[PDB]
Design a protein around this ligand. Structure first.
Ligand SMILES: O=C(O)c1ccc(-c2nn(C(=O)c3c(Cl)cccc3C(F)(F)F)c3ccc(Cl)cc23)cc1OCc1ccccc1
Ligand SMILES: O=C(O)c1ccc(-c2nn(C(=O)c3c(Cl)cccc3C(F)(F)F)c3ccc(Cl)cc23)cc1OCc1ccccc1
Lengths: 263, 259
């Protein structure tokens, strides 16, 4: 079944490339400076104002900067959820699961996958925006006022550690599939076929990492250990959103917009 | 990194685990499953049978049981510390990192090893001479009842893997040698030791559970559930501290929980 796992790896890679707008391979070329197309840099309040007049960043509807950026992260996350939902359908076996378990697996997986894939857009100095056309500095995000500064920095701290593994897109395509097919999500009705699919994906990821990183000792194990850190930081993440809700009375969104963002 | 060396490391760790921990999973399972006259535990299921139990096993009620667990936890810390010293390379690490690895490792290991003493109905106590029912523990008053039950929820799931003692010996070693503990000074020599231990665990699980697909991955995923439950534990212990001044902690546990 060696050729079967490679077929599964290639299938997921092809789908991952079609599902997501900015791949890791492309994002790294932008971040490192390796075919022109130099991104607009947002490093302070003035260059943010000019950036939405030039890039027209899809986040301009509160007048306060820190809130507008925070809500920007929400808008992009809602888009990522739909992209991840579309990608999940290409995982062999997923659409044949009970419909409620599909919803459940997506509901509890999307946060871990967004964190994971956000690392692809990050280095220690900042993050790509607008499909790589802009670059927002870490220092500017970290220095946002009151809770917002400390809301952004944990994402960078995770990404820097996760990126030391040096996964590429063909590695990440299987890893993301493994996260989705987690048989311990609360409320699953039929755990057995989810775990059976995840076992196939784990075999595929194990073989992929040996062939693509033959010199990287116990990388498979190290990546599974990261699925630990993910459960933890997603939990911290949610407890940070709750504090913003109870503290900040300037989060006035139209009730309909609030409904779009409810998750 | 080569097979005979990985098998040699597995045998070393199992041999040392048997020397360090007096009540193995193999012994606990023989006691739990029964059909043996000689190894039958006295069963504590209510207040009256607890009273008779201290006359037989020589083992406020909720406090006395909590205090019972602390005493055994301190002994467990001692046993785990002794085992850690046998892990090749551990004592050669920077002394501050040895402390750090134990500080954050003992709790995850106690939980792991407590599963060996448990089934869905209760837990062995007093080196297997007693068995305290889950329902009795769960029904202890105020915060103490809900303090015991998460251990059982984990053990039922962990025990579904059907690991034996030779498996757990390497798994416990992998937990201790975690390079992501806060405050470590030299991550690299710890990660090199864990890499050998992970190679050793991977091969051990393939040879000992050849029909158990991706058991390695499933066991590493369990180190997730451990990290979470240790967190819930300390958050419950903190609430007990604010309510109960009629109890103190052993200085060893006290230092372990500081930060
Ligand atoms: O383009 C992308 O793929 C992209 C995806 C996510 C983010 C982003 N989310 N986020 C979350 O707090 C989050 C996560 Cl992690 C998970 C679930 C839900 C949320 C949220 F709460 F938002 F609903 C961030 C926090 C800090 C920074 Cl730095 C970026 C993000 C950004 C993306 O693209 C880069 C970007 C950066 C700023 C604004 C817009 C886009
Ligand atoms: O014999 C053993 O090896 C053994 C070890 C641990 C426990 C046990 N600890 N505990 C902790 O709340 C704990 C932990 Cl996990 C870690 C650190 C500190 C503490 C504490 F809070 F105490 F400071 C429990 C909670 C519920 C149950 Cl069910 C058992 C335990 C029991 C052991 O043996 C079985 C046993 C059970 C009751 C009494 C005596 C012995």
């Amino acid at each position: 079944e060696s050729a079967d796992l490679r077929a599964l790896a290639k299938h997921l890679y092809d789908s991952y490339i079609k599902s997501f707008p900015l791949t890791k391979a492309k994002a790294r070329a932008i971040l490192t400076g390796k075919t022109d197309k130099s991104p607009f840099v947002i490093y302070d309040m003035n260059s943010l104002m000019m950036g939405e007049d030039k890039i027209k960043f899809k986040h301009i509807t509160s007048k306060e900067v820190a809130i507008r950026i925070f809500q920007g992260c929400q808008f992009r996350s809602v888009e990522a959820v739909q992209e991840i939902t579309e990608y999940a359908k290409s995982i062999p076996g997923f659409v044949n699961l009970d419909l409620n378990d599909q919803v459940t697996l997506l509901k509890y997986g999307v946060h871990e996958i967004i964190y994971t894939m956000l690392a692809s857009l990050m280095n220690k100095d900042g993050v790509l925006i607008s499909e790589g056309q802009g670059f927002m500095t870490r220092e500017f995000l970290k220095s946002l006022r009151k809770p917002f500064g400390d809301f952004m920095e944990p994402k960078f701290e995770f990404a820097v550690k996760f990126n030391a593994l040096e996964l590429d897109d063909s590695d990440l395509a299987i890893f993301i599939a493994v996260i989705i097919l987690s048989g311990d999500r609360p409320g699953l009705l039929n755990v057995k076929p989810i775990e059976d699919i995840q076992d196939n994906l784990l075999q595929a990821l194990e073989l992929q990492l040996k062939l693509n990183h033959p010199e990287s000792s116990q990388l498979f194990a190290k990546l599974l250990q990261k699925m630990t850190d993910l459960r933890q930081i997603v939990t911290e993440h949610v407890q940070l959103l709750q504090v913003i809700k109870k503290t900040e009375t300037d989060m006035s969104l139209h009730p309909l917009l609030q409904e779009i963002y409810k998750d």
